[PDB]
Design a protein around this ligand. Structure first.
Ligand SMILES: [Zn+2]
Length: 117
């Protein structure tokens, strides 16, 4: 029920989403180095699946610890991130804020059949 802060990654292909370690946390300048960790969750349909990012300890799978195994949940973190729930970041209120356009830093390797839109 809680909304992601970011727009989705579209799964235009076959394989499930996955990133190298250290990669895949959306850019968000209203979040600190401590805050750069969480999960993408594949959504159940409204066609190509969409994956949405949530900060660790927020959202549909807030109760999961990092790296926990669940179908349609994959984990990402940046070096420096604290392994704690991001209660102060939370999830987005669509009444107050539009989705942030999901952007990843230069070089980042999106898997085959994924694009930011
Ligand atoms: Zn913070």
């Amino acid at each position: 029920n809680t909304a992601s802060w970011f727009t989705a990654l579209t799964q235009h292909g076959k394989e499930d989403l996955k990133f190298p370690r250290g990669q895949g946390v959306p850019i968000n300048t209203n979040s600190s180095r401590d805050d750069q960790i969480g999960y993408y969750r594949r959504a159940t349909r409204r066609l190509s699946p969409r994956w949405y990012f949530y900060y660790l300890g927020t959202g549909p799978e807030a109760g999961l610890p990092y790296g926990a195994n669940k179908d349609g949940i994959i984990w990402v973190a940046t070096e420096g991130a604290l392994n704690t729930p991001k209660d102060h970041i939370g999830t987005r209120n669509p009444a107050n804020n539009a989705a942030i356009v999901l952007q990843l830093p230069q070089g980042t390797t999106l898997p085959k059949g994924f694009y930011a839109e």
